[PDB]
Amino acid sequence: LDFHGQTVWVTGAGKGIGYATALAFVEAGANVTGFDLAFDGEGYPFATEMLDVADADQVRDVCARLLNDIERLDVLVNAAGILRMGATDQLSAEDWQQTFAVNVGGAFNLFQQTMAQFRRQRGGAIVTVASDAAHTPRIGMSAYGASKAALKSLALTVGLELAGSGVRCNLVSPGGIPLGKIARPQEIANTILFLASSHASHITLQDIVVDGGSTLGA
Ligand SMILES: [Cl-]
């Protein structure tokens, strides 16, 4: 998987899956910019942009400035996300609002700021990190799963809106079934790079569930 010379944006890049994906693209030769609310880790070998991706004004400001400097956005990875659990009737107003603001609104903002670039340049790839909680109901995750189901739906319609421009748009849904140990971020990142790569050039509007089979194919 070679991304030499390609410009790659990754949200949620301060930690977790987003960080692992940003690092994997750096190691594959890409020019990576990571976006996150905080960069509290000890090492970021890529450019960082610290903002609330849930905030449409901040995303507009940062993305417009970056798009003035780059000639192509080769890969966009949406990997922001927060997990707030609870019985539906106990979940706080704050946890409900912030779950949707971050888990759906962030990608919505990124799509609003990048779709014109994808149309202009032709081509490119988008990968969005959903969740297997978007595929089956999970006790304690009603809001999380619902936000990830909205994210998936949004990403698929954006993929249809950009299909005429040659853009591929896919998802990954992380977690004797489950088969194996829980997938670590580095392993999710592998699947993201596959879907962003030329080896996936006729794959679009697909969602690979990486959870050891827990959804039994759903
Ligand atoms: Cl958090």
The annotation status of 82 as a binding-site residue, yes or no, is: no
Rounded to whole angstroms, the Cα distance separating 99 from 58 reads 18
| Residue of 182, 172, 79, 87 lying closest to 131 (CA atoms) | 172
Report residues near ion ligand 1: CB below 5 Å. 82
- Distance from residue 82's CA to the centre of ligand 1 (Å): 5
* DSSP reduced 3-state for 186: helix
Q: How far is CA 2 from CA 32, 123, 194, 208, in A?
A: 13, 17, 10, 21
Active site residue 144: yes
* DSSP reduced 3-state for 133: helix
The annotation status of 173 as a binding-site residue, yes or no, is: no
* DSSP reduced 3-state for 187: helix
> How many Cβ atoms sit within 10 Å of the Cβ of residue 61?
13
Domain edges within the chain: 1-218
What's the distance, CA 203 to chain centroid? 17
Contact 55, 49 (CB under 8 A): no
Method: X-ray
> How many Cβ atoms sit within 10 Å of the Cβ of residue 135?
21
Cα–Cα–Cα angle for 8, 182, 144, rounded to 5 degrees: 70
Q: How far is CA 36 from CA 86, 95, 99, 108, 187, in A?
A: 25, 19, 15, 15, 21
- Distance from residue 96's CA to the centre of ligand 1 (Å): 14
* DSSP reduced 3-state for 172: strand
Rounded to whole angstroms, the Cα distance separating 114 from 171 reads 17
The annotation status of 36 as a binding-site residue, yes or no, is: yes
| Residue of 52, 110, 119 lying closest to 78 (CA atoms) | 110
Please give the backbone phi and psi of residue 42, each rounded to the nearest 5 degrees, phi first: -90, -5
- Distance from residue 12's CA to the centre of ligand 1 (Å): 10
The annotation status of 207 as a binding-site residue, yes or no, is: no
Contact 56, 109 (CB under 8 A): yes
**104 secondary structure, DSSP code:** I
Instruction: Please pick, among 144, 183, 191, 210, the residue that the annotation labels catalytic.
Output: 144
